[PDB]
Amino acid sequence: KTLEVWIMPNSPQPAEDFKALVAPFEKAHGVEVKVTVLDAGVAWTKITTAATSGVGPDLTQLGTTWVGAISAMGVLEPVDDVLEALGGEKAYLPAVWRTTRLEGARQATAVPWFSELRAFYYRTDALKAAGVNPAEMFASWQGFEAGLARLKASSFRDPETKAPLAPLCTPGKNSWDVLHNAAPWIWGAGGEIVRQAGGRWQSALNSPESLEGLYFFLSLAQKGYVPAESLEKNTAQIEADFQAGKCAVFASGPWMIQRAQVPEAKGGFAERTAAKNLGVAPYPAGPKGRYTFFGGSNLALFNFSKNKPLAKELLKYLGGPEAQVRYAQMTGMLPALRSAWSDPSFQQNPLLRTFIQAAQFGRTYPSLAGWGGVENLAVQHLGMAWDLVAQGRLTREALKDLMDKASAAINQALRHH
Ligand SMILES: [Cl-]
Ligand SMILES: [Cl-]
Ligand SMILES: [Cl-]
């Protein structure tokens, strides 16, 4: 009776890394664990098909935003026992603990595996030449826009491109990335994507505070601080532009830290000026607070598994300190288990300590059963606002009107089962 785990492509050799990760467990339990890697755009199909049919793995990886929807289908084994075994609620950042259950449930259905959090990379050489103190550019909204204005004015040129750097690269192409790149600006203004109000869940995208945050961010791209060509690039293309010395500032996760230490000859960018002049800073505080976007993945046990006892031991293993530290070398992500962040692999690296500083401000979306329909509508409407940005036509009224249509659509979505 062999355990079957479904994972996503979390690391460069994902199945191999998973197998090396669980080798100690396999030896101590005298078993092999079988792993299947789901590519990005079959994963949700496969996991919902397993849920409806009862034909599936023992364990599956779930994105943190999927936990509510799969939990609500009645197919996940409770794992409150596993979480207690790992230290309970105090073992996690609150934003991470929120991803263990359907929103408002008392019962956990997912075990935190790894976190994806986002912070600003910057060129230390470019900010020095522009006269910009990184501490004050990334401390506040006013600092951030003043930094980008100095970066625009700067005579500095990249030593290898012999060209100027764009102040800020951010994508404007409807993807899940656009809502998470917007979320800290929404949150820092005092806004939300959805909230509880008046006895219901509702959109808050058209609240004055959400609109202040969204407008602050999107307007930077209309002020000359984001190149036109950045708005149609995906997240991989923006990362490649930063490596190639085209971008002074961009937002990413911790994986870029490792890639900057790997030579070009093995797929990294150690040789590039950007690697040798690399800074990280958390998102700036808005007028109502400082937030860092959390996502990542959790693990869940299908309650139709015939191997539930062994599968819960594997959940405890994967969720626990040693496996949390090890997998992080492989994924480029932060452990979901907060005690793992003390490991010297993080604490002896000044850029990873900065991500752990950023982590203290972590926030995530509400764990709603209907989150994916909310996020689809939010992303489509935000991409309509980015499309106005591409024309130089985003005004506060135009953004309000888009978010009023977003919020009508969201509100109707949340009214349905
Ligand atoms: Cl949260
Ligand atoms: Cl929210
Ligand atoms: Cl306006």
Side-chain angles (χ1 to χ4, degrees):
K1 44 252 172 56
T2 299
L3 276 177
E4 172 73 38
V5 181
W6 284 359
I7 70 168
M8 288 104 80
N10 299 325
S11 68
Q13 287 180 286
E16 279 194 13
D17 289 335
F18 185 82
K19 288 287 284 171
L21 182 63
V22 298
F25 180 87
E26 285 176 322
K27 187 177 206 103
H29 289 81
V31 303
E32 294 270 356
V33 169
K34 301 186 193 274
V35 64
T36 305
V37 183
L38 310 185
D39 47 296
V42 293
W44 174 261
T45 293
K46 288 209 59 207
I47 289 162
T48 59
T49 292
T52 57
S53 72
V55 180
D58 303 291
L59 304 181
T60 188
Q61 184 177 343
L62 296 181
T64 55
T65 69
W66 295 1
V67 171
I70 303 306
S71 296
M73 299 171 68
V75 295
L76 299 183
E77 191 67 10
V79 294
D80 292 317
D81 54 355
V82 173
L83 296 181
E84 285 314 295
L86 290 175
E89 185 172 357
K90 306 258 201 190
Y92 301 100
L93 198 66
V96 174
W97 191 248
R98 183 181 207 168
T99 74
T100 62
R101 62 202 62 222
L102 176 70
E103 190 79 14
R106 279 216 323 171
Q107 187 155 63
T109 46
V111 176
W113 197 18
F114 59 87
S115 290
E116 179 145 16
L117 81 181
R118 299 176 68 73
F120 280 109
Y121 289 94
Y122 66 87
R123 281 290 292 276
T124 57
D125 56 345
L127 270 67
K128 173 149 200 324
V132 173
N133 169 42
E136 51 160 59
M137 171 164 182
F138 297 102
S140 67
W141 288 11
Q142 305 99 309
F144 189 84
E145 187 176 353
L148 288 173
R150 290 198 64 81
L151 282 156
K152 183 97 251 236
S154 179
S155 45
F156 183 72
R157 307 178 194 167
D158 178 77
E160 306 178 305
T161 71
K162 274 64 171 202
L165 286 72
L168 180 63
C169 309
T170 189
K173 254 187 107 202
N174 59 9
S175 67
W176 288 336
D177 292 269
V178 298
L179 183 59
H180 73 33
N181 290 338
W185 301 101
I186 299 166
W187 289 339
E192 312 74 31
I193 302 158
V194 292
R195 71 182 296 181
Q196 289 184 288
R200 80 180 172 165
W201 288 99
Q202 69 188 33
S203 177
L205 291 173
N206 62 345
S207 72
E209 288 182 352
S210 300
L211 286 170
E212 288 152 8
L214 279 176
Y215 191 80
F216 181 83
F217 171 51
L218 264 70
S219 76
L220 295 176
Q222 288 201 151
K223 294 173 189 171
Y225 300 145
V226 178
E229 298 65 41
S230 171
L231 305 178
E232 295 92 27
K233 295 192 161 150
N234 50 39
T235 293
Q237 282 169 301
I238 298 291
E239 291 181 358
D241 285 354
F242 181 92
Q243 301 179 197
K246 293 166 171 157
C247 304
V249 176
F250 86 109
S252 193
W255 53 84
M256 298 294 295
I257 294 156
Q258 286 171 1
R259 300 305 311 159
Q261 302 167 52
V262 166
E264 284 285 346
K266 319 213 187 199
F269 70 109
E271 286 80 353
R272 296 285 65 76
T273 307
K276 310 167 147 299
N277 296 273
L278 187 63
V280 165
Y283 272 67
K288 286 215 179 166
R290 199 174 200 179
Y291 300 96
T292 299
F293 180 73
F294 270 59
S297 284
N298 296 350
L299 287 157
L301 165 61
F302 282 123
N303 63 23
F304 50 79
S305 179
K306 298 192 171 77
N307 303 298
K308 289 189 273 190
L310 182 57
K312 281 193 171 175
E313 294 182 337
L314 178 58
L315 288 168
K316 192 173 156 199
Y317 178 85
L318 285 175
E322 285 181 304
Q324 285 278 310
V325 168
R326 284 203 286 146
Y327 197 45
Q329 320 279 31
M330 313 163 138
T331 62
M333 297 271 68
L334 189 73
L337 188 74
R338 180 166 59 188
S339 67
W341 303 349
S342 73
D343 195 78
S345 62
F346 306 111
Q347 289 305 317
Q348 292 181 348
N349 188 303
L351 304 175
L352 289 170
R353 291 193 310 270
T354 303
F355 266 96
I356 289 160
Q357 290 174 321
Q360 306 307 314
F361 302 112
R363 181 165 174 182
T364 200
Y365 307 133
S367 289
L368 302 181
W371 188 261
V374 170
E375 175 144 23
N376 178 54
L377 290 168
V379 159
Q380 299 324 317
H381 290 78
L382 293 171
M384 294 178 201
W386 277 113
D387 212 60
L388 288 181
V389 167
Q391 296 174 65
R393 277 190 40 218
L394 189 73
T395 61
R396 287 172 177 88
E397 172 205 353
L399 172 69
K400 178 183 157 294
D401 289 345
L402 288 170
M403 295 302 106
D404 283 337
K405 290 178 185 306
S407 294
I410 288 164
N411 286 356
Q412 168 179 80
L414 287 163
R415 283 191 288 279
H416 284 88
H417 3 299

